[PDB]
């Protein structure tokens, strides 16, 4: 249902204390971090330690959904609202009512939805596409981005008004390279995960761990996870030394 | 429905007297000011103290709406007007009839709509897109921009003719840094707002207030508001001294 | 429908006599003048005192229309002519047939349309975009610019051939600062306009008038008009002395 | 369809004899001359006294067409050739097949098209943009410029190879100031033109004619034509003496 | 049912050892390689040497299926789900249950399906289009692309999260030009194939083989295969020397 | 397809012997000479007497192609490589594979392409723009310039490394003025050409020939060719004496 946040680094302790400070509030949470730094983890964990903890967790991938369809997707539509609407459909908002609405890649939202979103957050009311019935919405907002929304705001591609209404309680996730002391504990977490799912088994010696620590980790913790998966096939039930690492990961 | 305008500074008193001078007139109001300086506040307040006060308030975000769709959005369209127009739809103008039409980010209007808008303001007539039925429009115009329309006019990006028809009664909103004497009263307003919505509670001591007063406030009053929100979570039901401020806001 | 041209200055008398000389001819009229000097006024007045006086007046704003769409906008298009042409549409030319076509900001026309325009004026024939049906056009041409077409022609940005076919009968509108003796009569005209529309009422004393006369009037007569509008709100049904002027307009 | 070339000057007689020498040949004609010196006149006249005389006359304005679109415009394109090519279209070349292709402002051709043009002239073959079907082209070339192609060639802005393939038979049009003896006969031609089109009527006395003869005529014969048009409105059905000339044209 | 992988090159031996390492695991396999390099071969071979070896092999061509229909095609639909859904239909996923799902041209997947796919891979649950019944899915994932997914990820056209969940065990197929030592053995394989299907017979001499070895092979091994087919018709039951090669393939 | 090289001068005999020495080699040929001295003639003749003689001849005009587009033009591009690349396109190199690539105006190549070109010549490999697929290239290089590449190299505008890789076998074409003994034979060649194409007929007497011999010929042999073309129109089927020459060409 959720994951804990593993690590001993100052920053990850800070993230945990921050998470606790805000979870049971209904305040808007914006999580920033590079891809695969733990942002969704933080989000679902926030939800199951919140007032929405017995409600729905409803993700929206703002970048993945085509701009022309994003409106219907968030707000639902009436039958005949647009071409291909032989249905009347509840939106992500409607489904998220009483639970959490998790706005991922919020920087990839089109300006048109950024404004529509803010009126929904401010008024707490919405209409399905093609409708004039105003409807009630009770969602806790959580958002995440890997983009620099501040520069976007200067570029004129992200709304400043929306920025401050979403950024009440920012949480910053450090990239893996800036917390290489966490790698061993994260590796224990990932291996243990794999062993419980019956996906295999490995373990790393100390040499191979400090080699991993000089890695730059462009995919951060998700890329660490990937590596655990590949080694489990390449050296099944084996011990991973420098030699068992792919050459890309050996740093000596 | 509306907010009052808090503050004791010369400028904010001047804005209030100006607001009263013009509210119950149907004259075009242009409000200039940096993001989050109170421009919408001024606008809705003007509306509910105007002849449109029992009519509709209909916002248009000129920058948010894609240029190709702005025409339909203001003037409505007939069925088949363009690809995807399986509907006939009333425009923002049509919905604003008898009430107020609030033109926000008016500098972000495309030149093509700037001309079309002016013929509507001058003739007081319009057609839906794809139609030849001329229709009647009775709206009070209110516009707002954070841009320098004068320089835009020299750059050739804003229409001079439209500028003078919109700028009958300019109202200038001072940025927060130029009225730091208002911060305490605005803080009382924002806290009181939060306490009434049951979003929490804080209060600021004098040290922390004058620290806030040396802040530059790039997001102005909306950024002040944001800070009240974050402190309410970081120090719930607490008193905010210099130490309780984020370091970015401590100036001693 | 039209406005008369107010004033006693030599130049404005000259403009009136010139207007009469040419109105009932079908000759091409080019009106030059700074923004807000009366150029459209001259144009519609010419039309309603011409052979087109019972026909259509069809404005084109050459600068306002995006260059990629200007062709269709003047000449119309067939269905499928370009992407988004699910329609077949009559152009500005087609709508102007038998009436007047008023070419405003003609210096802002792209060179590509300058040539296409001239073949239309010379051949008196055109095709809709995407079509090969040649069509007949009977329009009286009136054009206006605030730009220096002669320098444009040397810069290579305005076509010389088009210049002479349009500039058969030039009419020059003096800027307001060069005819400050007209200000009082224009003020009477503008006030009387406002009083008839029920937009309010003022009047200017002699001190305030000669203060206005030392003004430079960058927006010329349209800017004069704007001021009458603002004073009507600032001093409703009042008399405007030097003191009632905004400081920008006091010159003593 | 065409115009004759009026005048008694040595040069204009020379142009006529030259025109006859080359008309019924298929040789490349380059006509040089200042704006409005009769270059198009020479061109269409050449065409209707040529082997293409029952074929198409197809003008291309090399300066007017945007460089990015000039290729498609001359050679046509396939569907999908470039963004916005939902059409397959025949080029100016394809339309000119069997008739004349008149290359006006040939000095304003971009170097990229100068090379492409020459391979077409040499190979006598072309492809539509986005296509690999080679197509046949039978056009007689006529070109005109007011620019100094020789200096352009030294500047590196005009192709030398293209220069010699186009300049087989140069025809030079004298500017009006260098043939002021022609003015009277040209004035008879222009007036007679105007009288036949029912655009009005004037005539010039001898004083006014020799005043015109000391004029420098920057717009040459097209500017002469313009003047006949303005006088027809200023003194309808009148006789034009020195006094009836605009002051700019009085030279005594 | 499957094909073996012919060749003696280091890389092809490496591919075989890699294939064995991972076949009987249920790990996600991503095969990269240019068109016709053996990627499907690797895939079906993996399947019939896997835990799915008695289950279904279910190909999806992500590029071939229209984006609007890809969702239904993978997940199935309910009756009335969309216009034309008079049927209820099992998806590719549903049909692949217990067997292998082979995701070919995975880079040609639309971002909208990339996200939907990942939730299916992570949750291991799905709904038919128009349905709210969650369903179970047990498939082994195999994917293939000729595109550079890493650059796609920077271009923002391929999801990074999906990349790492699919790229657990990458297998790279060398293009034919980089393993020209394999050509002879592959030719023996292809000829033997043809002879068994009774499609004809040839054989290559040594001269013609080393001519083939200097070929660049844009279509790689599938293009090699094509050539064997054409020679079998051009020189039935013949020996193929340099002279019997098409000129495009002679390199001496 | 090609032309022979006419003339009896030492230099032209030397060029012929040089041409034979190198044609059937794959060595890089650099041809230097003033505009219109026979450099392309030498090039195509080299090609049709080479190992590429049944392959493609693919000209590139380094000066004519805009610097920003030269890269794509030589190397091709992938779809989306740059703005306006809705296509994937083969480059001049790709089209020249197995045949000749003729680099004309090689001194007009930008330094950026000079380096990229050399890596292609040295590695014999390339990528389309926006791609990471390395591709094979088999072209014979022929280059031509009228510029002084040595001085360019000192000016720092031409790469020295590229100079020596291109200048393996230099061939120098003498300007026409330095071989005036060839004029008669070249005139026979050009007339005979014209007579075969049915473009007319002339012939020169001895007086007119030696007048031509004192000419300086800035356009060299192409300018000679031009003159034959003009005389064919000015004196159709005539004999050209000193008197029939244009005055510019009479030297007595
Ligand atoms: N501190 C952590 N402790 C344990 N597992 C972690 C931690 N951080 C990340 N992970 C795991 O590493 C992976 C990271 O996944 P996510 O948190 O979903 O990435 P993300 O930051 O949300 O990336 P996006 O797509 O840009 S929002 C998952 O497998 C997590 O379970
Ligand atoms: N004088 C004021 N008194 C009380 N509240 C204020 C005052 N000025 C601003 N606010 C509040 O501060 C925030 C400012 O919001 P807006 O007035 O809507 O900003 P804006 O100036 O319209 O910015 P934009 O997007 O560029 S038009 C809102 O929460 C207002 O309620
Ligand atoms: N001589 C005049 N008498 C009366 N009203 C005038 C006179 N000149 C201008 N106006 C008024 O002043 C304003 C000037 O408007 P226009 O004539 O439309 O300006 P314009 O010169 O056409 O400017 P553009 O946009 O560059 S073409 C209008 O309100 C006119 O009614
Ligand atoms: N010799 C002439 N006899 C009679 N009419 C003439 C003569 N020369 C020019 N004209 C007229 O004067 C005008 C000159 O027009 P064009 O010949 O088209 O000018 P142009 O030289 O082609 O200029 P461009 O745009 O630089 S190519 C036209 O009205 C002609 O009909
Ligand atoms: N190593 C090999 N040994 C034997 N046959 C091979 C080998 N590699 C390829 N082939 C054959 O060559 C052809 C290549 O086909 P595929 O493997 O299906 O190509 P592909 O790489 O999957 O291309 P796509 O469409 O981009 S996924 C088939 O006829 C295979 O049987
Ligand atoms: N020796 C020759 N014998 C016969 N014809 C020749 C000879 N030299 C030149 N020509 C002809 O004269 C003209 C010269 O053309 P090119 O050889 O193409 O000139 P070029 O030297 O390549 O000039 P550029 O543009 O600077 S590379 C063509 O018509 C040739 O056919």
Q: What residue segments make up the domains of chain A, in order of their start?
A: 1-176, 177-252
- Token pair belonging to C42: 């001259």
Question: What's the gap in Å between A31 CA and the centre of ligand 1?
Answer: 12
Report how far residue E179's alpha carbon sits from residue E221's, in angstroms, rounded to the nearest whole number: 10
Q: Tell me the pairing of strands C140-145 and C169-173.
A: unpaired
Quickly count: other Cβ atoms within 10 Å of residue F198's Cβ.
8
Contacts of F134 in chain E (CB under 8 A): none
Q: How far is E165 from chain A (nearest CA, A)?
A: 7
Contact assessment for residue B32 and residue B175, using Cβ atoms and an 8 Å cutoff: no
CA-to-CA separations, B234 to A17, A23, A60, A114, B248, in angstroms, rounded? 11, 12, 28, 27, 15
The token pair at E28 is 């996600």
Query: What is the three-class DSSP state of F247?
Result: helix
Work out the end-to-end distance of chain F between its first and last CA atoms, rounded to an integer number of angstroms.
39
Helix (H) or strand (E) holding E207: helix E206-212
Q: Which ranges of chain A does DSSP label H, i.e. alpha helix?
A: 10-22, 39-48, 67-75, 92-96, 111-123, 149-155, 160-166, 183-196, 206-212, 220-234
Report residue D188 as tokens. Answer: 């008879």
Q: What's the gap between Cα F56 and its chain centre? A: 16
User: Positive or negative, the Cα torsion across F142, F148, F151, F155?
Assistant: negative
Distance CA E50, CA E98 (A): 11
- Closest residue of B to C62, CA-based? B112
H helix or E strand, kind and range, residue C32? strand C29-33
Q: How many angstroms separate the alpha carbon of residue E31 from the centre of ligand 5?
A: 12
How many helices (H) and strands (E) in chain B? 10, 9
Kindly provide the b/e burial profile for residues A156-183, where b requires at least 16 CB atoms within 10 angstroms of the residue's own CB: eebbbbbbbbbbbbebebbbbeebbebb
Measured between CB atoms, does D55 come within 8 Å of chain F?
Answer: no
Q: Is C90 on the interface with B (CB under 8 A)?
A: no
Which among E111, E92, E93, E123 is positioned nearest to E149, based on CA atoms? E111
Taking an 8 Å cut-off on Cβ atoms, the answer to whether B21 and C234 are in contact is: yes
- Alpha-carbon distance values, A150 to A112, A159, A161, E23, E245 (Å): 18, 10, 12, 47, 63
Q: Is the shortest distance between the CB of C183 and ligand 3 below 6 Å?
A: no
Cβ-Cβ contacts under 8 Å, F66 against chain D: 112
* Residue in chain D lying closest to C81 (CA): D87
Q: What are phi and psi of E31, to 5 degrees?
A: -105, 125
Strand blocks (E) in D34-136: 57-61, 100-104, 125-126, 135-136
- Residue keyed to tokens 């794509």: F72
> Tell me, what DSSP letter sits at residue A138?
-
Return d(Cα F103, Cα F165) in angstroms, integer: 13
Q: Which chains touch B (3+ CB pairs under 8 A)?
A: A, C
Is E76 annotated to bind a ligand? Reply is no
Annotated ligand binding at E52? The verdict is no
Interface test with B, best of A14, A25, A28, A78 (most B CBs within 10 A): A25
Min Cα distance C21 → chain B (Å) is: 29
Eight-class DSSP state of D125 = E
C63 three-state secondary structure: coil
Q: Which residues of B touch C102 (CB under 8 A)?
A: none
Element holding D33 (H helix, E strand): strand D29-33
Among A40, A36, A41, CA closest to A219: A36
Burial class (CB in 10 A: 0-12, 13-18, 19+), D20: exposed
Asked if A225 is an interface residue toward chain E (Cβ–Cβ < 8 A), one would say yes
Are C222 and B112 within 8 A, CB to CB?
A: no
Q: Best of F36, F59, F175, F224 to mutate for ligand 6, by most ligand atoms within 8 A of CB?
A: F36
Give the count of Cβ contacts less than 8 A between chain E and F: 8
Q: Count of CB atoms within 10 A of residue A228's CB?
A: 21
**CA A38 / ligand 1 centre spacing (Å):** 3
Interchain proximity F136–E247, CB inside 8 Å: no
Nearest CA to ligand 2 atom 24: B35
Which residue of chain B has the CA closest to A165?
B226
C-alpha angle F51-F53-F55 in degrees, rounded to nearest 5: 100
Q: How far is the CA of B188 from the centre of ligand 2 (A)?
A: 15
> Resolution limit in angstroms?
2.5
Beta bridge partners of F143: F30, F103
Architecture per CATH, F177-252: Orthogonal Bundle (1.10)
How many CB atoms are located within 10 Å of the residue A116 CB?
19
Which chain B residues are closer than 8 Å to A69 by Cβ? Answer: none
Beta carbons of A13 and A6 less than 8 angstroms apart? no
- Number of C/D CB contacts below 8 angstroms equals 49
Q: Is the CB of C144 under 6 A from ligand 3?
A: yes
Of A218, A223, A146, A188, nearest to A7 by C-alpha is A188
Q: Which residues in chain B have their CB less than 8 angstroms from residue A115's CB?
A: 61, 64
E34, E38, E43, E49 alpha-carbon torsion, rounded to 10°: -150
Closest residue in chain A to residue E81, using alpha carbons only:
A87
**CA triple A3-A9-A11, angle to 5 deg:** 80
Q: Considering only CA atoms, which residue is closest to atom 7 of ligand 2?
A: B38
Nearest atom in ligand 2 to A161's CA: 25
Query: How many Å from the N-terminal Cα to the C-terminal Cα in chain B?
Result: 39
Q: What is the distance between the alpha carbons of residues B121 and B139, in angstroms, rounded to a whole number?
A: 9
CATH topology of domain B1-176: Rossmann fold (3.40.50)
* Chains C and A make contact, 3+ CB pairs within 8 Å: no
Which one-letter DSSP state was computed for residue B133? -
Token code pair at residue C165:
């076919």
Q: Do chains E and B touch (3 or more CB pairs under 8 A)?
A: no
Strand order in the sheet with C57-61: C57-61, C100-104, C140-145, C29-33, C169-173
> CA E36, CA E58: separation in Å to the nearest integer?
19
> In this structure, how many other beta carbons lie within 10 angstroms of the beta carbon of residue F49?
15
C63–B111 CB contact, under 8 Å: yes
End-to-end CA distance of chain E: 39
CA atoms within 13 A on the CB side of B37: 23
CB contact under 8 A, B112 and C64: yes
Say if strands E100-104 and E57-61 run parallel, antiparallel, or are unpaired.
parallel
CA distances (Å), E195 to each of C69, E41, E187, E224, E246, in order? 63, 20, 12, 16, 22
Is there a contact between E160 and A36 if contact means CB atoms under 8 Å apart? yes
Secondary element (H or E) of residue C29: strand C29-33
Residue labelled with tokens 């419980």: A196
- Determine whether E6 is exposed, middle or buried from the number of CB atoms within 10 Å of its CB (0-12, 13-18, 19+): middle
Name residue, tokens 């647009």: A82
Distance CA A228, CA A195 (A): 11
Binding residues of B for 3',3'-c-di-GMP: 1, 45-48, 189-200
Say whether D227 counts as a known binding-site residue.
Answer: no
Phi, psi of B181 (to 5 degrees): -70, -20
Q: With contacts defined as CB-CB under 8 Å, which chain F residues touch E34? A: 133
Write down which chains contact chain F via at least 3 CB pairs under 8 A. D, E
- Residue F8 touches partner D, C-beta closer than 8 Å: no
Distance B226 CA to ligand 2 centre (A): 12
Q: Which residues contact F56 (CB under 8 A, 6 or more apart)?
A: F95, F96, F97, F98, F99, F100
Contact list in E for residue A81 (CB cut-off 8 A) is none
Chains meeting E at 3+ CB pairs closer than 8 A? A, F
Burial of F217 (0-12, 13-18, 19+ CB in 10 A): buried
The CB density around residue B61, as the number of other CB atoms within 10 Å, is 22
Measured distance CA(C243)–CA(B69) in Å, rounded = 47
Q: Where are the alpha helices (DSSP H) in C87-219?
A: 92-96, 111-123, 149-155, 160-166, 183-196, 206-212
Query: Hey, are the CB atoms on D161 and F36 less than 8 Å from each other?
Result: yes
Residue nearest to atom 19 of ligand 4 (CA): D36
Please report, to the nearest 10 degrees, the dihedral formed by the alpha carbons of residues A183, A188, A190, A193 taken in order. Answer: -170
Location of structure tokens 């400050």:
C180
The Cα–Cα gap between C230 and B169 comes to 6
Give the other-Cβ count within 10 Å of E252's Cβ. 9
The residue among E1, E123, E131 whose CA lies nearest residue E54 is: E1
Residue D15 CA: which ligand is closest?
4
CB F134 within 8 Å of CB F93: no
As a whole number of angstroms, the distance between CA C138 and CA C93 comes to 9
Query: Which residue's CA is minimally distant from atom 16 of ligand 2?
Result: B38
Q: Is D222 annotated as a binding residue?
A: yes
What residues of D are in contact with residue C27 (Cβ under 8 Å)?
199, 229, 232-233
Query: For residues F142 and F139, what is the distance between their CA atoms, to the nearest angstrom?
Result: 9
Burial of D154 per CB tally in 10 Å (0-12, 13-18, 19+): exposed
């Amino acid at each position: 249902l959720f994951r804990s946040l593993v690590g001993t680094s100052r920053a990850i302790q800070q993230v945990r204390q921050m998470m606790q400070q805000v979870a049971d509030t209904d305040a808007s949470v914006l999580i920033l971090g590079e891809s695969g730094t733990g942002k969704e983890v933080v989000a679902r964990n926030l939800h199951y330690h919140s007032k929405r903890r017995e409600g729905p967790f409803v993700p929206v991938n703002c970048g993945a959904i085509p701009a022309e369809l994003l409106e219907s997707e968030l707000f639902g539509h009436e039958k005949g609202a647009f071409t291909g609407a032989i249905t009347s459909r509840a939106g992500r908002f409607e489904l998220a009512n009483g639970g959490t609405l998790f706005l991922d890649e919020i920087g990839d939202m089109p300006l048109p939805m950024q404004v529509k979103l803010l009126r929904v957050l401010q008024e707490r009311t919405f209409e399905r596409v093609g409708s004039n019935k105003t409807q009630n919405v009770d969602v806790r907002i959580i958002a995440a981005t890997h983009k620099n929304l501040e520069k976007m705001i200067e570029d004129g591609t992200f709304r400043e008004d929306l920025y401050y209404r979403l950024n009440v309680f920012p949480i910053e996730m450090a990239p893996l390279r800036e917390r290489v002391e966490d790698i061993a504990l994260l590796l224990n977490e990932l291996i243990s995960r794999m062993e419980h799912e019956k996906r295999g088994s490995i373990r790393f010696n100390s040499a191979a761990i400090m080699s991993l620590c000089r890695h730059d980790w462009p995919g951060n913790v998700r890329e660490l996870a990937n590596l655990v998966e590949r080694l489990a096939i390449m050296h099944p039930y084996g011990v991973i030394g420098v030699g068992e690492l792919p050459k890309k990961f050996r740093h000596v």
